[PDB]
Ligand binder design. Sequence first.
Ligand code: NA
Lengths: 298, 227
Amino acid sequence: DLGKKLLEAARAGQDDEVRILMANGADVNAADDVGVTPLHLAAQRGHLEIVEVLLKYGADVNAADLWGQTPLHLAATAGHLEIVEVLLKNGADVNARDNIGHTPLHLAAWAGHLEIVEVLLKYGADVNAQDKFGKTPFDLAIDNGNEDIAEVLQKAAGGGSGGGSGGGDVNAYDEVGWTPLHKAAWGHLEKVEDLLKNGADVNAADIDGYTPLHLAAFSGHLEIVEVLLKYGADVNADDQAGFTPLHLAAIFGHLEIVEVLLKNGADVNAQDKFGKTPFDLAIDNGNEDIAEILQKAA
Amino acid sequence: SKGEELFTGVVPILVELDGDVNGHKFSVSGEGEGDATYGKLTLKFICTTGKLPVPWPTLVTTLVQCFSRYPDHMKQHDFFKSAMPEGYVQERTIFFKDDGNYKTRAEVKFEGDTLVNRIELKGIDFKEDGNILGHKLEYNYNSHNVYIMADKQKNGIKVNFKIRHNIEDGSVQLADHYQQNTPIGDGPVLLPDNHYLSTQSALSKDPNEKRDHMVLLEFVTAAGITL
Ligand code: NA
């Protein structure tokens, strides 16, 4: 009963009530039914006085909830810098792993907390740690658009400046088979050009069978479609994808993309996973001008 | 217009699923928290009726994409939060390769301060010795790309993706997801440009839970639209 009240007082930031409950014998390491302790709640919600008093009274600084999260994970995600520092000074494991294998540095990088990234590095965070999907904190920062953090993390790994714009093995791939060019297909024309100029494989297929040209057609980027084709992209790539770039262009109504695909040999008779041709999809989606062009090319 | 303001902090979650797969009925309840600023879910589910007659991983997608991290430059593309608090209907057909399918209909909405996902699930044509009814799927989960597009009727969104379930013998069972979301309310919603979500999940067990159950940690972010 005292444990529950201490959990609530910690959560609500009632440092006066925390002190009272401790003097009445409350268990500083009380846990709810998902393993969350008073220190977890105070650290997550930014209640520094309460974090300090709990640690003084012997709270387990590395207690893990059901999801593997320690108080440091939660404070690093929530962005509470001084709480991060206090936890580290009281023995928090700087490289503790949540159930996905994230360290606190992964979480701060994911969450966009640059000052916390820097304190975690100072206290021994492993810059090369990988989560269970192979991502480093740098990878998470990049994929989330946290470029300032990515720049810091690449420097801390000895890779020099420039990490903010990507760390450049042009043919790296992650666990879903995305290369830098798959990421650049989403409207980053200058990066697409730079990658191809430095030897990126234009026809790399991801785990679902999608090439960069599929993604550029899905996202509707004409000039990217053009340069992928100029660099030898397979205009009719399908295999595991179950559809071609022309099927995608016919769905989303980009007449100019349909026209360049046809100009480059796209197959008007290719069938998707439901037996539909691009003409069928253009009809189904109300794209009449595209349908007329595809019928002329039948 | 202001649905996103309901997700600035940690939000309690309730999930209720009523399921029937090949006549095997079951109920699943879930609870926990979502922290949409960071695309994070911390949930625990129990099969309240007894043993779950399908593998837990096959229900993950059915069991709240309003908690996806949408970065600041993509705020105008977050359909899911824009439908709140009145919510949206989420419907899927999930085709398991060389096996049966699930069809689901869910309502996702606020009930007070709680975000509630209430689902009905029907499974048909499963093989009693297939990977699903025969429980041959590993208790784990992969990372996926989730593709989002505005629907052609200008009401909601369509969503497509392929889930990969690792099979105990080392092969992979595909579950092909076809999804549609429409607002429950008459208020205006955000119809996005085409983009994707990238997912991470971990499944675990609670040593103090005696019922059939799943602990789930999930991180999801949107991407594909910049500057
Ligand atoms: Na504070």
